[model samples]
Target: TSTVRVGFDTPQSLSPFNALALPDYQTARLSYDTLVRRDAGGVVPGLAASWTGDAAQLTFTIRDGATCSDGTEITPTVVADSLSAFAKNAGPSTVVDTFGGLNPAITADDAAGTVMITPEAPWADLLAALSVASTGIVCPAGLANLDGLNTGSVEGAESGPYVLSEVEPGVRYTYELRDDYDSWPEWETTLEGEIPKTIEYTVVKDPSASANQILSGQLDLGRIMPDSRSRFSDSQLVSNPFGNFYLVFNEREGAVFADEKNREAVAQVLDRDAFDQTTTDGTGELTDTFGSKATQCATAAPRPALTALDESAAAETLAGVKIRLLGAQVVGAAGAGNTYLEAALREAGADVTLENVDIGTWAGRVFGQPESYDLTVFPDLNFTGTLTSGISRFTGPDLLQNGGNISGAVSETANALAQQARTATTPEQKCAADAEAVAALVAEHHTVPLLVESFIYAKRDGFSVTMLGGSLDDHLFRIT
Candidate 1:
């Protein structure tokens, strides 16, 4: 039996019900299984052995002999219950937007071994939406103890390839493979090499440090940042866009960014190359488009550059303007890039106050306490399979359906285009709508995109991993 070591940052929550960060979504994949799975190769079976669906609804056939971590059989009824629990517990999460705010009507036929989910509106990419990690099925034991389940303390809550054995809190997590599990993705029939018997997650917050650990054999797989990008340029590596790192304004009254010219000035004073250098060692790809190669209808029409970095105009507009910039601790070079932003704004004659805080606090200031900040880095990864999923953050009201819009980026036209994408029956219509929606937001500077993040991982000499939708498939690590 072999073991695979992976490094990750601290997760906000291990709860499959509520995903607060990228790590949260990735970690849940270890102990949970989705109805279906998708990747570059195409869609395949997950928990459900087969599925039949149209634009409006889907019916999944549960695999025979599917067992949970707690040694209980996964039934049709349990599938419905777990999905229902997710909808109730998922609050202000990106998955709700990915699934197009689906409050699906689920019906189960125990004897027939079938479960159906009917969405209120016609969904263009319903299968892809349901394929996300947040939609992973939970066991009955986990459902009973929702609080413990969310905290990763509920035993036998997992229904995946492996069971969570030990969680050492913010440090290391250990998982043991379930020998009886066999419901891997249907397209993935290759078991040519022996997979690891044990998987260990070692938490190392710094990007360069994680890279170093990879070389030292402390980590079997680690994502390399800019500082370490050059080191792995000659080595065999798999690279994919994680998300777009963009800027958004708190466009309310009396704020520095309330005035259109002032908001534009911040972009004009911005230096993308310098920020990229500080954070990603200047290896980050510069892009004005929010959509990546993985996104459907990936737009080619890039947004026009913002006023050509005119220091003269920026100083004139920004002088005496007090700006409060809030940065998410998780993004941009471990807070180093935040300093670069503050300095750039200050040099433009603005009185800048920068606060790099945790994601939870940063989110509160952006969504809950909008008045406390004038501008921010938008502390969220727009990485997704669907174009409209992450872009939905800037549109419409908050999760509670209140006037306090998410990220305070309320755009009627933008939201309309995205909403249109949700219900379009044809792929062409959905693609066109999504492209238009992206154009609308950037044209108005609702969100100033810096660059799309790349997740490049270095694998040990003889180890192999399966990449799905731009992320390392945690369940498929093997010793070749």
Candidate 2:
């Protein structure tokens, strides 16, 4: 077959620059190019031919002749404008702020084909952060029509190997090949010169159907959950624990979880092993920290001393506590975990209500309207591979202003320690500060870290996939 059909869940937005979830990333990667991309060793060239920088300043020379899907040349000015657009919009808050440290200035030199980025504070992972899918560069046409980007109306203004060609609403999307595309370097090991002529992404909501689709010749590739993976015994599966699942609490006033004792009591009643077994189907690895197991800056911290399924301990602190558990409706594990939590809390003499909201509502209630939810379970990716970046979601004062810090447990000491880690000159110094900050959060029982989970996707027997770190490299897929 000349066309490769891949299965993905529905996405809220198609614009890579504004994406917040995993499906959005998978959708955006099909049509956009990042300045840099992460590989096995470190940051590698993508649209940027090469780069050099220090903690305070970074520079990248645009590749000689890269063009957008519309055949327009990708210049330093375009890169600069794309980044400026992302900054102005609310896209990729962590990736942008992690390196530049709040309101860093950006500039471009057209003649020299250079883009220079200057952050207010010294950040070590600027290049790595840029490599993330959220930092993908788009053409001016796409940037001008940001409103239509999510609806497949402005997908041609991107600069990747594939361009969005057709859409069937909630069913599928077709990506036609952009033949004038030799922008990838050796570092982008997943993407090769030879690729599929057409890539079709199908929206499959059921795990059993998704797996069956791949085996029945309907889908060339599909993402499979742990429980359904056994069906594809003869197929090739790529899986890894790319991130952590955290049970986050809202520390705002008038919330039951605002009390540390209540938080600790609930944490004690949670059977991590049981939750992990249910979510990952007994194929999960437990971690004490929220960062991915592949992260280098993450230090080994001790898990919280919580009594396992201690109903008495839970009742002692959280007796008659009525809690609203908010979870995303699209995530399969979220639904499964919420079921367990509701039952467990009720068994421990606490009142629990389950509210499953759509992705948009989940985001609004969790990050925009904090008072609406008392607790929620979500997957936070540590894509930047830094300790400070991983923990910044729950600790910084700036997050408090925007309600991004859902825990509302901001501490001067924790923020100061995180800042120390961010500004540290050496990796060792950064790790030390990050370790200290994590310890503070642990002491306060600000958030509960469940088992580190990995996702598995199955591909046809005739195809091969490239996986870097824990994520399947979006750029790579070939017919064997």
Candidate 3:
């Protein structure tokens, strides 16, 4: 049997639900597809196939014939319960804002085979807001072994495409075809005639190593090399857009980042337009909130919780305190550092210290346990969730699992708005709640939204690409 070999930068945990802790969305996207699926635009699809309702309650019709990897029939209750778990576990105001204060646990039954989710507040965009990775569905069978006990396993869990055959924790993960599966939808098509028999993933943290594997034909899929812009002469470069790259402030840090004023000061210091040119090859779009320019959020025009740089706010914050933004000088580690970002920060007022750390150190300092740094260029969190989804990431007790919340950020109002968003049934209500959450977040400076940077991936000759849900949707099932 042929095997599709993919490479990842790091061997992160296998828990697919936590968007915050995972190394990247691409990994989770594959792992979590069983519980939920996204449309071409990353909208939710699972047991609850479609729905319509009013504020405070949403009624979703459970689709027939959808089964788990274990062959268990999926129902509306199962989907709603799964969403409840996300509402419980998600943290970081950024994640929470996407949900818009809707209580996952809040509910009532209106009919048979239909699940009604009722939130405390009126949220119009609740269905659209709920269509996020954070609200992904999980049947009773899929939730069986979620804790960190099962290792070297793709066995105990259930999802789409292939069943797990072997899991080597941090080394590799392997999947074999599910021949008996009956749940695949007709809308899905593939250029790669029959699905491959087996798919194997190896964790290769070095970008260069991943690039080499792709070029050598040892790997079928891996992140593009940092400098492969001109190397892949005949290959396709795919653009995957997700959440905007952002800077987080440690409100708990006693220095300038701790104070909201200094945070704004830091915001005004860097020029986003120039930074975009250098770091993203000028293929970035500016945004003020958590969700990408795609999604219903575009029409919503949701305001960021935090505002953009205001010289006055910067002056007020820098009046007394001294602070510096610390990150890697090299790209692909923290914020894909370019000369412009550092220079811009310095020009704005705060002291900027560029640290030349290895990628390993950058990973540890930024993503390691205890999250020791105050501010760093972060891999996107809440990338899949909009406003309510954004807020859900923040306000929970298990905030550490949610990954997006930086240190020292807490908002009761944001949490409340998230609940409203979750309960909202109309687009108008969802947008209002999201706007409130965004305004609240920007006002506090917990998350500073920047340009939505594309995940530009380069491939060697004869290599094909498959884009899944996010920025890579257009590239999902292609083989050459």
Candidate 4:
């Protein structure tokens, strides 16, 4: 059996259901299958052979011979049960809420080989939501070891295209392809055409290190940072418009960020253009709104005008405030961008402390414990669920606990607009509601959209890889 060796910039938790970080989602893609799959071509069938529905009701027909890694044939009841289980988990709720509300109504007909999903309200992005990696279907047996999921103890035990044959947390993950698997209808080649029989993923947090690994022939594919792009002679660089890097303000009553001026002051002093050019190597796209041009509702939200470095104004606005900034140690210029912000803030006479935490700490301390940091940075933001998913971080009842919405930003108007978009019957109505939500977020100073960036990863020569923006749909990888 042929084997493909891959490298990642960060380690991943084995919990397929709780995809709080990018690596977790990547891991889930290798080990589990969702009802639907998304890529550059858009939403298509995955575990479900076919699906049909509108805003009111949706039905998914289970694919023939869909079986788990352990060779357990997947049934309609299993699909229903897995989805139902995800809805009840905290980590999976974000994706679940995208399709249906917190409490969705689901039914399964084993004899008909179909599962029915009835959302409490109309959801325009229901199909898109179902394609999210977090919503991947879990085997009934994998669901039983919930606690063991994150610890890498129950990784290979799940049903996915690749099984986790071996694991060394923060080091590497070894995956063996399932020979009997053929359930993905969206993929041109399910498990054929020079597919690697075995796959290995190693964690290399430094972009330069990843580039070095590729050049040294220790890694077949990895991300190439801006600074090290010249080192590669043969590579494919893909861009993801969904990569929205932004700063979040803690909006708790007594938080320093409670004062909008303080947040505005920080935004003013930081030079976005300089940061993008210097950190991203001129690859970052500039945007002032949290939602990018790709968002369902691109609105005329007022963009905050950038001013020259006014030390006096910055100090006056944030002199007494002690700011704590948090973010993960991302690859390439992503991490350096945070440092630039820290220097800019300190130069403006504000007391700022920057801490780069691991993905787990970031998900827990930043997303789970919002009270711990005054300001935070998110390197990559996914707008997969369209309007409802994009604005979810700014305003939601469960904003604090949801890993992605760590800033705990809350605005009644924004929340209302999100609801309006979700329930709107027509595309026009939905677009209007989305615009309102973006306007609400911009006006309230809830988030500072720094730059619209793309995630870039490099692959060695003589390999065929299909990337949907920055994400690699491993199912499509083959030898050239």
Tell me, by TM-score, which candidate is best. Answer: 2
Better of 2 and 3 by lDDT: 2
> Per-residue CA lDDT of candidate 2, range 320-392, in tens?
8889888764335436767777777888788888897555457656655667778877666667676655476
lDDT of 1 by residue, 284-402 (tens): 67666564565567753433444467889999989989888888765665677788888998999899999987554565456556677788775445434556655666787654464
Misplaced by over 4 Å in model 1 are 188-192, 230-233, 252-255, 300-307, 329-332, 357-372, 378-384, 400-405, 423-425, 469-475
Worst 10 residues of 2 by lDDT: 299-308
In candidate 4 the C-alpha lDDT for residue 414 amounts to: 82
Model 1: lDDT to the true structure: 0.72
Model 3, 150-179: lDDT tens digits are 232334345445555777766677867676
Q: Please give the TM-score that candidate 2 achieves against the real structure.
A: 0.92
Cα RMSD of all models vs. native, in order, equals: 3.0, 2.5, 5.4, 2.9
User: Which scores higher on TM-score, 1 or 2?
Assistant: 2
Ranking by TM-score: 2, 4, 1, 3
lDDT, model 4, position 420: 78
Worst 10 residues of 4 by lDDT: 467-476
- What TM-score would candidate 4 get against the native? 0.91
